Structure formats: structure tokens, C-alpha cells
């Protein structure tokens with residue numbers, strides 16, 4: 686038995702973002718006056734893209750995922766032309782926005798974010814869910830500034846760009862790219878052309894600015910190993926001395 690929702694159940698507020706298949710609006714559940722986000726997806730568009738099978742899968746997964754660092758999907762409903770997703774609202778915005786505003790994050794903020802991401806990823810893996818698109822734009826912030834994964838090129842691991850087969854280790858690579866981008870302000874393999882970025886990733890060619898410390902370099906270099914089996918386990922990330930020295934939050 687489940688709860689049935691309807692459009693008339695919410696007071697539509699301001700638009701929060703624009704999607705390639707619809708828009709997201711801030712909203713309030715009329716009964717509880719609870720603030721949430723309402724993502725509207727157009728079927729006609731979801732159809733003309735062959736991503737419907739992807740949405741159905743993601744919605745199934747998200748509904749079952751319950752973690753403080755994963756954006757919550759409370760439910761959904763639809764009509765003749767639209768699919769509505771009832772999502773948790775992250776009042777502090779995207780990590781992407783904070784990064785652009787600050788240009789780069791200090792070690793404390795970065796290690797904290799990496800810890801929250803590692804926890805969320807560890808939870809996902811325990812549920813056989815892998816390959817989360819954790820780019821800054823897909824990372825939101827809760828009322829206390831806690832990170833929330835909301836993924837529902839510069840970040841693809843060597844195995845993927847090379848058309849090879851992969852596993853959960855792709856998420857460890859992602860974590861290394863994010864740790865670097867958080868500390869530096871830009872992803873490690875950024876280049877002028879797609880072709881150049883590709884060769885940069887394939888060869889794991891990147892440099893560290895002078896302000897990136899020894900501990901951060903050790904963690905990033907280990908996460909960004911070309912060979913997936915040489916990348917640390919998520920528990921090793923959470924126990925890394927750079928993480929335990931800088932994270933403002935425990936695992």
C-alpha cells in the first residue's frame with residue numbers, strides 16, 4: 686500500500702532549475718506545509734530521447750535509497766503528458782554554485798564533502814548501485830550544509846572512455862576527480878578539446894598546483910590510478926590520514 690499524490694496537493698513555487706526534459710519547482714505540500722522540490726518531466730520529450738527506460742530504473746532505485754547524503758525521492762505521480770517527481774529540497778543550493786562563488790574549497794570543506802560522498806557511495810555499493818554521476822552540479826546542500834548526491838566527460842574514468850568494461854571502482858575514480866576539483870577549482874583533465882581531455886584521462890596526465898598539500902596529493906593520486914584494482918576501497922578513503930585530519934565530520 687502506498688500514498689497517491691496529485692498536482693492539486695502542492696502549492697507550486699518558484700522555478701529552481703531547467704532540465705532537458707522539464708523543470709524543477711520549489712513547492713509546498715498543502716496538508717503538511719512541508720517544503721519540497723517538484724521535478725516535472727514531459728513524456729513527449731522523454732520519449733523522443735529513449736531515456737524513459739532510464740528514468741524508470743533510476744526512480745526504482747532512488748525510492749529504495751535512504752541515506753542522509755543522498756537526495757530523497759519521496760514519491761511520484763503522473764498525468765496524460767507529464768511525470769512528476771517529489772524530491773527533497775536542498776536549501777543551500779548546489780556545490781557547483783559554492784565552488785564558482787569561492788573559486789576553490791579549503792581542505793576542511795573538501796575533506797568533509799569527500800567523507801559524506803564516500804559514505805553515500807559506500808551505502809550505494811552495499812545495495813549494488815554503482816556509477817553515480819557526482820559532478821558538482823549533481824551535488825546539493827542541505828540546511829546544515831551537508832552534501833546530497835542528486836544525479837537523477839571530465840569525470841569519466843579511463844576504462845569507460847576507452848570503451849572497456851568497468852565496475853564499482855569507477856566511483857572511486859570520480860571521487861578523486863571531485864577531490865581535485867574541490868581543492869583546485871577545475872577538474873584535473875580539463876583541456877581545449879574532447880580529444881585532448883580523452884588523452885589526458887587515458888594517460889592520467891594532470892598536475893598539482895603548489896597549494897595542494899602532501900596528504901591531498903596522496904589521496905588524489907591513489908584514487909586516480911589507471912588500473913581500477915590499484916584504487917583504494919571506500920573504507921580506506923574514510924580512514925586516510927588527510928581525511929581524518931581535515932574532515933569536520935566523522936564517517
Ligand SMILES: O=C1CNCC2=C1[C@@H](c1ccccc1F)c1c[nH]nc1N2
Nearest residue numbers: 701702709722724772773774775835837
Ligand atoms: O535543478 C536544480 C537547480 N539547482 C537548484 C536545485 C535543483 C533541483 C535538482 C538538482 C539535481 C537533480 C534533480 C533536481 F530536481 C533540486 C532538488 N532539491 N533541491 C534542488 N535544488
